[PDB]
C-alpha cells in the first residue's frame, strides 16, 4: 500500500509524460504503481489538475528481476 506522498513522488518523476494513458510501471521488479489522469479529466489543462480529484493509480507486478 504505497502512501499518497510516494505516489506523488512518482507523478513528479514522470511529470513530462503524465497523461490519461497509464504510465509505465514505477519499478521493473516487484510490486510498483501505475498512474494516469482520469479519462473524465482529459480536457483539463495541467494547472487545473488535483491529486484527489483527477489522478488514478493501480498496482503493477513486474517480473524482470
Amino acid at each position: 500500500e504505497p502512501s499518497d506522498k510516494h505516489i506523488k513522488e512518482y507523478l513528479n518523476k514522470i511529470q513530462n509524460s503524465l497523461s490519461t494513458e497509464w504510465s509505465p510501471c514505477s519499478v521493473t521488479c516487484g510490486n510498483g504503481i501505475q498512474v494516469r489522469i482520469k479519462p473524465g479529466s482529459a480536457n483539463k489543462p495541467k494547472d487545473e489538475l488535483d491529486y484527489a480529484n483527477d489522478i488514478e493509480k493501480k498496482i503493477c507486478k513486474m517480473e524482470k528481476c
Partner: antibody, heavy 123, light 106 residues
Framework: EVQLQESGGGLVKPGGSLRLSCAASGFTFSSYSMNWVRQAPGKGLEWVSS????????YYADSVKGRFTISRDNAKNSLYLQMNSLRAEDTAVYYCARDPGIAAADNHWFDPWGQGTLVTVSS | YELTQPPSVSVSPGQTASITCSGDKLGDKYACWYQQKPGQSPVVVIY???KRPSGIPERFSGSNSGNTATLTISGTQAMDEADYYC?????????FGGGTKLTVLG
C-alpha cells in the same frame, strides 16, 4: 528571460479602491496559474489570491475575501488585482508570482516573483 | 493550516545552519523554501521538499517528513544571511511559515 513587472501601487485613502497590474513575459502566460502575495513592511509573506490559466478556478486568503478580485487577460499577458474597501492593514508590498509547479501532484511553488509594488493605505 | 518556524537561527561561518518548518502531517505535503535578502524579492532555494533550482549554491539542501520540513545550509557563508520562508499548500490555499532570520555570527 522569464519576467514579471507589477505596477499600480502608491497611496490610497482608507476605504478606497486600487487596481494592481502585473505584466508577464518570457513564458507562455496563458498556461500558468498566477498568484498575488503581499508583505507588510518588516513582516512576513502572506498569500493573497490565485487564478488558474483559464480563470476557471480562483481562490482568496480569508483576510481579503469579499474585498479583492483577481483576474487576468491572457491576450495581454497581464494579471490583475482589484482591491476594494482598503484598510490601513492592507499596506504592503504586493508581489506578482508565477506557479510553475505540478498541480496533479499537489506540488506548488512560486518562481519567479515580480519586483513588488508598495501600496500605502493612509489618510 | 499553519506552518511554524523558529524566528532566528544563528551559525558560525563554515558551519551548518538547520532551519525547521513545522505543521500537522507536513511530511504528506510538498514544502518549498524562499530566500529574501533586505530590499529584494523572495527567491526559491528549495522546492518539492528536496529539489534545488539551478543557480542556487550546492550548500542548500532540504528534506520533509513527519511534521518537519528542514532547510539545511552546509558551510554557511556570510552572504547566506537572509530571512527564509517555508511554504506549503492546503486545499488550494497557499500557506507561508512566519520566516526565520539567519544570522552568521563571528
Amino acid at each position: 528571460e522569464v519576467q514579471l513587472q507589477e505596477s499600480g501601487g502608491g497611496l490610497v485613502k482608507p476605504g478606497g479602491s486600487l487596481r494592481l497590474s502585473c505584466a508577464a513575459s518570457g513564458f507562455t502566460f496563458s498556461s500558468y496559474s498566477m498568484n498575488w502575495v503581499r508583505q507588510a513592511p518588516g513582516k512576513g509573506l502572506e498569500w493573497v489570491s490565485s487564478i488558474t490559466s483559464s480563470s476557471s478556478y480562483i481562490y482568496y486568503a480569508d483576510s481579503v475575501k469579499g474585498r479583492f478580485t483577481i483576474s487576468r487577460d491572457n491576450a495581454k499577458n497581464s494579471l490583475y488585482l482589484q482591491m476594494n474597501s482598503l484598510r490601513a492593514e492592507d499596506t504592503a508590498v504586493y508581489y506578482c508570482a508565477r506557479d510553475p509547479g505540478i498541480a496533479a501532484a499537489d506540488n506548488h511553488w512560486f518562481d519567479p516573483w515580480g519586483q513588488g509594488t508598495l501600496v500605502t493605505v493612509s489618510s | 493550516y499553519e506552518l511554524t518556524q523558529p524566528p532566528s537561527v544563528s551559525v558560525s561561518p563554515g558551519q551548518t545552519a538547520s532551519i525547521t518548518c513545522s505543521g500537522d502531517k507536513l511530511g504528506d505535503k510538498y514544502a518549498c523554501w524562499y530566500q529574501q535578502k533586505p530590499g529584494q524579492s523572495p527567491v526559491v532555494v528549495i522546492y518539492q521538499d528536496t529539489k534545488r533550482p539551478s543557480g542556487i549554491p550546492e550548500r542548500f539542501s532540504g528534506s520533509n517528513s513527519g511534521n518537519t520540513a528542514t532547510l539545511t545550509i552546509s558551510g554557511t557563508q556570510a552572504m547566506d544571511e537572509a530571512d527564509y520562508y517555508c511554504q506549503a499548500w492546503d486545499s488550494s490555499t497557499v500557506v507561508f511559515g512566519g520566516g526565520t532570520k539567519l544570522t552568521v555570527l563571528g
